[PDB]
Write a protein that holds these residues in place. Structure first.
Motif, mmCIF file in Angstrom:
data_model
loop_
_atom_site.group_PDB
_atom_site.id
_atom_site.type_symbol
_atom_site.label_atom_id
_atom_site.label_comp_id
_atom_site.label_asym_id
_atom_site.label_seq_id
_atom_site.Cartn_x
_atom_site.Cartn_y
_atom_site.Cartn_z
ATOM 1 N N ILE A 21 0.862 -1.175 0.000
ATOM 2 C CA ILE A 21 0.000 0.000 0.000
ATOM 3 C C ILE A 21 0.904 1.231 0.000
ATOM 4 N N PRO A 22 0.802 2.114 -0.998
ATOM 5 C CA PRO A 22 1.733 3.237 -1.085
ATOM 6 C C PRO A 22 1.385 4.425 -0.207
ATOM 7 N N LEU B 298 -4.332 5.403 3.539
ATOM 8 C CA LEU B 298 -5.045 4.401 2.754
ATOM 9 C C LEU B 298 -4.880 3.014 3.360
ATOM 10 N N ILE C 246 -7.966 0.649 4.464
ATOM 11 C CA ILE C 246 -8.135 -0.721 3.991
ATOM 12 C C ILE C 246 -8.241 -1.679 5.166
ATOM 13 N N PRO D 176 4.953 4.237 -6.790
ATOM 14 C CA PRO D 176 3.820 3.908 -7.656
ATOM 15 C C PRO D 176 2.698 4.922 -7.459
ATOM 16 N N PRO E 162 -0.479 6.351 -5.915
ATOM 17 C CA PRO E 162 -0.840 6.156 -4.509
ATOM 18 C C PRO E 162 -2.238 5.605 -4.278
ATOM 19 N N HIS F 38 -3.011 2.514 -5.910
ATOM 20 C CA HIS F 38 -2.837 1.179 -6.469
ATOM 21 C C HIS F 38 -2.242 0.288 -5.386
ATOM 22 N N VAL F 39 -3.004 -0.712 -4.960
ATOM 23 C CA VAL F 39 -2.606 -1.599 -3.874
ATOM 24 C C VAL F 39 -2.123 -2.908 -4.481
ATOM 25 N N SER F 40 -0.855 -3.232 -4.249
ATOM 26 C CA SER F 40 -0.230 -4.399 -4.848
ATOM 27 C C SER F 40 -0.309 -5.591 -3.905
#
Lengths: 97, 26, 67, 225
Positions: free
Chosen positions: C40-41, C45, C49, D201, D203, D205-207
């Motif tokens: 998660i970047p 967030l 989640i 990446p 911010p 987009h959850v990988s």
RNA sequence: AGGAGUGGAGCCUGCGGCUUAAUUUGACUCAACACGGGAAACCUCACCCGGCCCGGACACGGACAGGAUUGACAGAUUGAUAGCUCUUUCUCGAUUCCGUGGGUGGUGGUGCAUGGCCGUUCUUAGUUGGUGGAGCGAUUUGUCUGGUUAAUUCCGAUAACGAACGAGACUCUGGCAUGCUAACUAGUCUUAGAGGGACAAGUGGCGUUCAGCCACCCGAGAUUGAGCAAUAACAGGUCUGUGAUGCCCUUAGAUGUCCGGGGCUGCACGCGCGCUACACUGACUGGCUCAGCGUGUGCCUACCCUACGCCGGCAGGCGCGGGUAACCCGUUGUGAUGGGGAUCGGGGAUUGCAAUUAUUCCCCAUGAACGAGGAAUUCCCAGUAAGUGCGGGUCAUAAGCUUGCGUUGAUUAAGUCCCUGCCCUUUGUACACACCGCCCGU
């Protein structure tokens, strides 16, 4: 204009010894940042540069309040034709190759 | 062909409208 | 409002279906495992989640949910 | 002799900006992309990026020597303290400046805007680029000037990520009729290491790490020959 | 039926009405009106009672040791130690000049020829393919019955499925450690960290018990400032920001210069931003350690911010040091009385030619509708508003403007579509230059 001719031959000596130069528009001042202390008044010298580069045969490029010049070989031929100084005296700029 | 497309889509209904459409494929 | 956008919803759903084994109910544990298994970047967030996955486990513990 | 640190940094920024503009108006036809200065002890090395380098050096570096001479005699550095190099760029087909110059020098000589513009959009796309948007605004002939824009792929506008994911170049192409403004925006693709894409990446987009297939017997029973 | 501050009671300027040297460009209501970061002597003034040194790579003409270049007060000039006096026949010495335009151009036109950067109907949540449905077609579905959300936010329904922008996420910003990385200017309080912390998380109550909403402990913090911000757009602004820009085109009174020279600092107001608090709360006894966010001195350049003495009562007329800056500035008795000032005068004035045709301190208490304000009204929901001062941009510490900053500090509403306006629907149309439309009638 309103340019003398002894200043003209002085500025022609300057162009012959110099060739490639960068200029800044400075007329009314008595003290220039980087082109003073030549024992010659600055206004007439800069107008001499204006004549050189606005006689209609050497192109200019002005931006950021500065002048960068591309001294064409047409100018070399013009100087040789007028002042009759042979180009066999190579410019000193061709060292540190 | 591309130049005709550009002229047509610049003003699709102006003075240069019928001629360009005709010139496209005719 | 506190409506969770499609990003957090989709991330929580895929997280819960892929590694249901490790995930639990206590927010601290969900946050830890979510950081461990999900790239998660963001941190905000990530917390969003983890909160939604906690809600989804409160949902699953009392029946099946279609998602 | 000494000026305040705020003034020092502002002057350094002015140095960078005017040097960039100067060698942008010099060698745009050389496919110049950007200029970077390197901090060295009591010296200032400058490295210059261009798509083509054989032209920027030329024969025995007449252009390079002319540029170093003019920069030295303009900036007031000590004699021979400024030296500019020329190294190729790893990101040529998706750099905004390079493609803006390519569009301008395909449009200068007289050519349909759409053919060359779609060609540069292509050459952007096969260079791995994630998304492109090109707008050409100006005289399409007639009493009215218009703007035509072609977009491909995904490209974002708002938020912080537009700073470090999208590079936009705005250029003027002088036609004998008028001036046509080209705005070319490219979003780089994400690729860690190599400096070919932004490190971070997007911010939102959850990988997730992907497990592999698992079809196993009921109990692990040791087998020996 | 709420309100506070309202434009009226304490610091002048924008542009039109508007005698000549005064009403001086662009902007025709919300999207012009201290706006061009445009605070008008002068370099930037084109309304200006006045002049000059002039501009030609060329197309045509006048023809060389003189065809004049800012360059003397006292006879004067139209303010001017300007030679312009109808004067001297001093002075760089071939420089120059005239009639036409491109030219080294012009802040001279046209932003109804442009680019780029902008303002807005757009602060609202709205836009778009591909493939598949429908329709001959323009086109339509996806982009929706509903519930929910700040949100086309999500749930869910479903000839649509998968996607793309916008929204969110994201950056900056304040809020938090009996924690951490360490400083001989503070003693881990100040400074700034690879980091943590909130998530509608815990519990109740409403919700095909879904998305979600309310409440409450707990918690520093429980719809927490701003920035960025979707195609088509508009003949909105900018050619007076730009050797960014295509040439139609005036004049030598070039819209170059030179402490120089009228204005606009008028008051029967034509308009628009602006300067301002009603009493034991407002203001002094000077009788206890206060904050600014930030600025500050050579490529230019000659102009930077500031601490003790001559002493009337302090900035300060001259010396005097510190500071390229966390080091110096700097730990910057019941209401017109005593209570907040209607013009205006003295003390040494900060040194800016001129300030009055805008720079410059408080004391004598000489008394001004001295206690919520025509029609029409703009802005605002918590550290709001408002009162205050302070620092930058402009600059000579030039502000009454603007952009920020703190200090004091909160009455009212946690709503609705009534006025103005907007949007995720249906509906009507003879409108499409789109209701500031179209259109009928001697």
């Amino acid at each position: 204009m309103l340019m003398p001719k002894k200043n003209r031959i002085a500025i022609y000596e300057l162009l012959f010894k110099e060739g490639v130069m960068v200029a800044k528009k400075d007329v009314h001042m008595p003290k220039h940042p980087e082109l003073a202390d030549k024992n010659v008044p600055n206004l007439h010298v800069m107008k001499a540069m204006q004549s050189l580069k606005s006689r209609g045969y050497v192109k200019e490029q002005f931006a950021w309040r500065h002048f960068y010049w591309y001294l064409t070989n047409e100018g070399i031929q013009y100087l040789r034709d007028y002042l009759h100084l042979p180009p066999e005296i190579v410019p000193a700029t061709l060292r540190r190759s | 062909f591309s130049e005709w497309i550009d002229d047509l889509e610049a003003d699709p209904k102006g003075k240069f409208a019928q001629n360009l459409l005709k010139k496209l494929t005719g | 409002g506190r409506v969770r956008t499609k990003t957090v919803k989709k991330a929580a759903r895929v997280i819960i279906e892929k590694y249901y084994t490790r995930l639990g109910n206590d927010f601290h544990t969900n946050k830890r495992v979510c950081e461990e298994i999900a790239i998660i970047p963001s941190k905000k967030l990530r917390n969003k989640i983890a909160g939604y996955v906690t809600h989804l486990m409160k949902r699953i513990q009392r029946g099946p949910v279609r998602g | 002799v000494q000026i305040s640190k705020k003034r020092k940094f502002v002057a350094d920024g002015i140095f960078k900006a005017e040097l960039n503009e100067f060698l942008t108006r010099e060698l745009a036809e050389d496919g110049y992309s950007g200029v970077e200065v390197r901090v060295t002890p009591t010296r200032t090395e400058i490295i210059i990026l261009a798509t083509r380098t054989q032209n920027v050096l030329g024969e025995k570096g007449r252009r390079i020597r002319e540029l170093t001479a003019v920069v030295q005699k303009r900036f007031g550095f000590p004699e021979g303290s400024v030296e500019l190099y020329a190294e190729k760029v790893a990101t040529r087909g998706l750099c905004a400046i390079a493609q803006a110059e390519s569009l301008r020098y395909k449009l200068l000589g007289g050519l349909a805007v759409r053919r060359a513009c779609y060609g540069v959009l292509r050459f952007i796309m096969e260079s791995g680029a994630k998304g492109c948007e090109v707008v050409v605004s100006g005289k399409l002939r007639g009493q009215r000037a218009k703007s035509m824009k072609f977009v491909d792929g995904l490209m974002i506008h708002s938020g912080d990520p537009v700073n470090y994911y999208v590079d936009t170049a705005v250029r003027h192409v002088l036609l004998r009729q008028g001036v046509l403004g080209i705005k070319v925006k490219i979003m780089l693709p994400w690729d860690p290491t190599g400096k070919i894409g932004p490190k971070k990446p997007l911010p939102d987009h959850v990988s997730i790490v992907e497990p592999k297939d698992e079809i196993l017997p009921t109990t692990p029973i040791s087998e020996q020959k």
